[PDB]
Symmetry: D2
Subunit: 115 residues, 4 copies
Amino acid sequence: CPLMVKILDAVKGTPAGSVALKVSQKTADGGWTQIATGVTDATGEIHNLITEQQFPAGVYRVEFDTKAYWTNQGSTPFHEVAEVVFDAHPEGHRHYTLALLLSPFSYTTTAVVSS
Amino acid sequence: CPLMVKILDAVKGTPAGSVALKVSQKTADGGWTQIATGVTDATGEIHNLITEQQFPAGVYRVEFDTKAYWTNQGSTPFHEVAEVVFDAHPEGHRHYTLALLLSPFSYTTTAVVS
Amino acid sequence: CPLMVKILDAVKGTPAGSVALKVSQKTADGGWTQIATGVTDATGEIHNLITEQQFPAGVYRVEFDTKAYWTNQGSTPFHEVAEVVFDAHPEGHRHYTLALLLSPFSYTTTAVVS
Amino acid sequence: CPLMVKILDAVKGTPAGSVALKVSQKTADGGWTQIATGVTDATGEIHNLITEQQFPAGVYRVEFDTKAYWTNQGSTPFHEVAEVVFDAHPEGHRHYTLALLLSPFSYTTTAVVSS
Ligand SMILES: Cc1c(Cl)cccc1Nc1ncccc1C(=O)O
Ligand SMILES: Cc1c(Cl)cccc1Nc1ncccc1C(=O)O
């Protein structure tokens, strides 16, 4: 699997479980095609989110529904979502991990890309 | 002015100057209408980005052109753009500052709401 | 003034007021001498923390009492303290701002150096 | 093993390999006893850093030598070190992961604590 996530909760000090997300692929006219969805497990991950065949070179957007996560925790969130948008170059089985650290009014996102 | 930004560069330890951005408001059908553009000054800020009259409650997106920023700094970036999407509640002259801390492969974003 | 701070609270979206801190400079033998203390105001800042005369080059530590801050906010914290340790190069009236973004189990810290 | 680290490099998008660190335990008179040292592997980790017997309840400091890491990468760093100081409550095999995200002038650190 070429696309992984890892979400952490900076209030409780745990992975962020049960965060819904969507993966989309940019189209030529500037639109977006939804290619996968899921909800993180208790480790803040979604295993086998997409296949290599689903992940050709191009621009991808991963939208994480952080607002619902905070509402369920009892916190008042600032952001509607956290968006991560990047150009993927999957040749040679290059892998992408999108790391995300959540607080009610803030997030940090980084990427780990293999070679 | 109800919407401010403060952008810092985590590599060189300065504000991030000359970062282009676009502000959009979400429509009832789920699309986006662009309402303003700007470019940060050497303090990482943009003065008078929009007016209160342009800022009813609703969902807004600020799209920061971080890819161009990092290319111009000479460092290969990861993100195509940095988007900050938030629901505004301006009643009571509430003001919003979007703070943004940039690295080539990472950013942190937070808000200060008065 | 050559040393400033800016502390934000990532839970409530405000500056972090009433955060206590202590500034120390490292001695030649590797110990620490405390040179100043302060407490942030409601903007998350401390004005006139030290003077240029108190700020030769060297290694400095700022110790922020984040555990007390979070206990007072009513949220269990992880860290006992947040320490920022850096080598200062004041020649040329160079000024340092320590930016700090706090959550109960996490912090981000960066610097703006003029 | 009750104490793990995970260090990432926010410039290159990789784990931060070959970062030296030290683990110390606070003493009653306010001093520090060094209990372990190591250097991260290419995954940004140190496996089996300490044992459970080495990790009684108390205050611990993990000092990461980030300055040398950036000098080797060719960057000019701000911080001398990154310090993480916390009170450990290891009963019930509670585990601590210290996550650290590095840039030349900035770091983010969070903890993942099990239960
Ligand atoms: C403290 C900070 C961080 Cl941690 C990251 C990005 C900008 C900032 N700074 C600010 N954010 C909001 C308003 C003012 C500032 C400032 O630095 O003056
Ligand atoms: C270190 C870290 C930070 Cl600083 C923020 C969010 C997730 C992580 N953790 C990871 N990121 C990527 C891959 C693995 C991990 C992990 O913690 O196992």
